[PDB]
Amino acid sequence: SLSREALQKDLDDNLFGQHLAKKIILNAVFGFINNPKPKKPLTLSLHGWTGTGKNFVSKIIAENIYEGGLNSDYVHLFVATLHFPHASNITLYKDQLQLWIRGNVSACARSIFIFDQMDKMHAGLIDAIKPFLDYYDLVDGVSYQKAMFIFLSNAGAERITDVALDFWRSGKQREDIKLKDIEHALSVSVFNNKNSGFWHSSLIDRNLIDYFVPFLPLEYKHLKMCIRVEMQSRGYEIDEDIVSRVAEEMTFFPKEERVFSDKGCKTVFTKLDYYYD
């Protein structure tokens, strides 16, 4: 049974450098789960830099709704690069995917489906799930209005970073970045007419995506926070000299200013093995 306080605490204690995502997710998820008569399944699209917390947030959402999180019987993970790797097999993926979603929602109206690597998913396979996302009361005799769909993607990461870098160079705080700043920078790509058309409802004048959730590239200080957590998780005494040396081995961009981690947090943890026995 989801609590707003518990979801907020889990986000605040564990998710670093994502002030926009924390707030959007907290209010979108709590408001939907707490609504006994939703009009449409909650559809979230989480976009942004590699290694900055998209699967991590998904686990936080899942574990706050169901015991076991991603291992709950009611939470379903599709990894497009693992499960849907070959474009020419689209029909075989589509047929299995439609059966799987329909059977599980039949059995559990409050099912959760996560589509990871959506930017590598055949557009025709995305088309196959659009009816489940819409404002229909019944789709082939089953209501999807209590279900939740979460998409994870890198598309838009570079543009989102343009905003973060502009704020950094201007002497502004990261937490001053607003959703409107991100939506404006994405007007030419993720938010252009063809994408808006692609994601449009087939029933009323609305988008199938309820919330765009942007993820910002991580700074050096966020990488240090994650290294400290990994040290504790391994049972090490934290050593700030190792924190700095590990973080210094990571590649940062732009070439001149060294502001953001190329890989977010990814690959950092294997470097601890060169500093600990």
Partner: nanobody
Framework: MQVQLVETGGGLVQAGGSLRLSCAAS????????MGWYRQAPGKQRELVAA???????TYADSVQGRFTISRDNAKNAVYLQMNSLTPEDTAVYFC????????????????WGQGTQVTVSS
């Protein structure tokens, strides 16, 4: 239902000649992610020759490129291998293979194999 692959078409071919192998499956093959042909020559381990997805995308081992063509007929539950320009290097037992994979959960492959057909290419 017991689904089985049966290969036919093997035999002796003179060097430079051609041969067509067929595999009939006793059940529907639409849902096989990949079907293909492997070969096992004396004292050697089995190796990929050619493969094809359900949507007809093909690939070939380096040693047969340009000479062999794989094709698939989902409606007739059959896969074929046309072999041209054969040399004694192609002598082997040929096996048809089918692979089925899940769309959720941990990776695995359910594999099916036929009993194989002997191809001998004389010098």
């Amino acid at each position: 239902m017991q689904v089985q692959l049966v290969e036919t078409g093997g035999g002796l071919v003179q060097a430079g000649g051609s041969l067509r192998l067929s595999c009939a499956a006793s059940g529907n093959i639409f849902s096989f992610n990949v079907m293909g042909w492997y070969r096992q020559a004396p004292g050697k381990q089995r190796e990929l020759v050619a493969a094809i997805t359900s949507g007809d995308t093909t690939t070939y081992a380096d040693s047969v490129q340009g000479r062999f063509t794989i094709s698939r007929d989902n409606a007739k539950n059959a896969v074929y291998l046309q072999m041209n320009s054969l040399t004694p290097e192609d002598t082997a037992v040929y096996f048809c293979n089918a692979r089925r994979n899940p769309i959720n959960g941990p990776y695995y492959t359910t594999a099916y194999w036929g009993q194989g057909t002997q191809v001998t290419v004389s010098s």
